[PDB]
Design a protein around this ligand. Structure first.
Ligand SMILES: N[C@@H](CCC(=O)N[C@@H](CS)C(=O)NCC(=O)O)C(=O)O
Ligand SMILES: N[C@@H](CCC(=O)N[C@@H](CS)C(=O)NCC(=O)O)C(=O)O
Lengths: 256, 264
């Protein structure tokens, strides 16, 4: 028995039972629940993140990734009162939870680190960029007004010219939305090919044992399902892609 | 009297390789066949090399029962027959594609050091796609224009035609225009540099400097990287100023990996 970990999450404008949504933060929430570690959520809205980080003393995760000159403060962040430690960046948190609690199933063993880093770069071009003009426009009006104004302005300032300016132009219903939906499906099919490269259909990257890179894929899937709604026609298609493999993974991480 | 018992020693595996225009001992060079050559020597299995020119590869593959490795890589409707191929007379089995060859050798010779265990298969296929983008495409306008004039005439014509016909249109036309000395070569060299630093960054993602992707143990993934570096060295020459530059990339990681695969 130990104290509840402090898990800093980003809310949308919904009641608390439905307030979690974010892809990156879900990596850590799913890491905590896989390890069955007790936690409480502490909600921080987008425009308050760096201030809230600076006050509890969590490091930034990257540098100049929004404004070239200043560090990038992000969620997830955990504070573990059992050790007094504050950790930011979902992968740094996972290692922390591996080392602090060896009883829990290890998620990122040393043997996985370089291959998972390969995956993060593969996943960026293959899944994240095809998915971005879908998830981001859809999550934006779900935020409360201050969060939406910060989310819209920062993400339009960064990905704006690469996609078509304002978020309504990213995937507008028509030939635009059709082509991007195609390239998103291709990316998931490419990713299923990695999983079946030996001629079999393993459930997880390592085989039957699950690790952090399965959590990562699940976190983004859980985000799309939470943001679109589990009966949205575009989520219902994702459920069927590649033999329903993505549906099986979501089932796995939901039942952690 | 006394009469021989039949020996049961491991017979030389037949390794099908692509020559260049040099004598026997400097005849290997190719990065894909090097994957399998290195897999054989890492496992310390006996093998002999059979030389096949590029335009003869398909005929040889069909003659010996080697399946194609892909579909439509050169002509839209046509199977792509490629080297490396081994034929193992110890089992009568012919295998194509460096990766399938690695699986066959792991399985058939289980007392040799394992190179592609099952728990690596999906991560390694991720790597081949990430490696294609960040290493292979930047490297292509350097390695192919240097290798091409080193081939025997029959392979030279076939290699120039097919590679220019497939890639030249997005690299400036004919091979002489892919990376000519001057700013074009220099900007492509920077892209290749950054590709390798991206790859070194994978290996240092935990803040440490593991020698191989897994840690202290090498696997098939390190062999793939070494085969491509060994090919660059063999084609450019060990004293080429550009090869000497690669030896100083990323704190010398690739030089150390080349050293590793050279002493298999
Ligand atoms: N690489 C980080 C990504 C964290 C991240 O980018 N989080 C975003 C949420 S989508 C954030 O909080 N950014 C702060 C901001 O936008 O101001 C991780 O995996 O933890
Ligand atoms: N990636 C596969 C394919 C290797 C491959 O494409 N080999 C080339 C040599 S560079 C080949 O034999 N191609 C024959 C041709 O171009 O006709 C493998 O590792 O075996």
């Amino acid at each position: 028995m130990i104290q509840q970990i402090h898990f800093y999450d980003i809310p949308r404008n919904r009641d608390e039972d439905d307030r979690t949504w974010n892809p990156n933060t879900s990596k850590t929430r799913l890491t905590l629940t896989y390890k069955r570690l007790p936690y409480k959520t502490i909600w921080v809205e987008y425009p308050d993140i760096e201030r809230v980080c600076k006050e509890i003393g969590a490091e930034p995760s990257a540098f100049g990734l929004l404004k070239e000159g200043k560090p990038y403060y992000s969620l997830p962040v955990i504070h573990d009162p059992n050790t007094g430690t504050t950790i930011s960046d979902s992968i740094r948190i996972a290692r922390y939870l591996d080392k602090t609690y060896p009883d829990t199933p290890a998620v990122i063993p040393a043997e996985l680190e370089a291959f998972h880093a390969v995956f993060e770069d593969a996943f960026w071009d293959t899944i994240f960029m095809p998915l971005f003009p879908f998830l981001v426009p859809a999550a934006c009006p779900q935020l409360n007004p201050r969060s939406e104004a910060y989310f819209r302005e920062t993400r339009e300032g960064k990905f704006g010219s690469i996609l078509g300016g304002k978020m309504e132009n990213w995937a507008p219903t028509g030939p635009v939305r059709d082509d991007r939906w195609k390239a998103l499906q291709a990316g998931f099919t490419k990713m299923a090919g990695w999983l079946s490269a030996d001629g079999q259909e393993r459930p997880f990257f390592m085989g039957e044992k699950l690790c952090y890179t399965d959590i990562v894929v699940g976190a983004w899937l859980i985000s799309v399902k939470k943001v679109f709604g589990s009966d949205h026609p575009e989520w219902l298609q994702v459920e069927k892609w590649d033999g329903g493999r993505w549906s099986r993974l979501v089932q796995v991480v939901e039942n952690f």
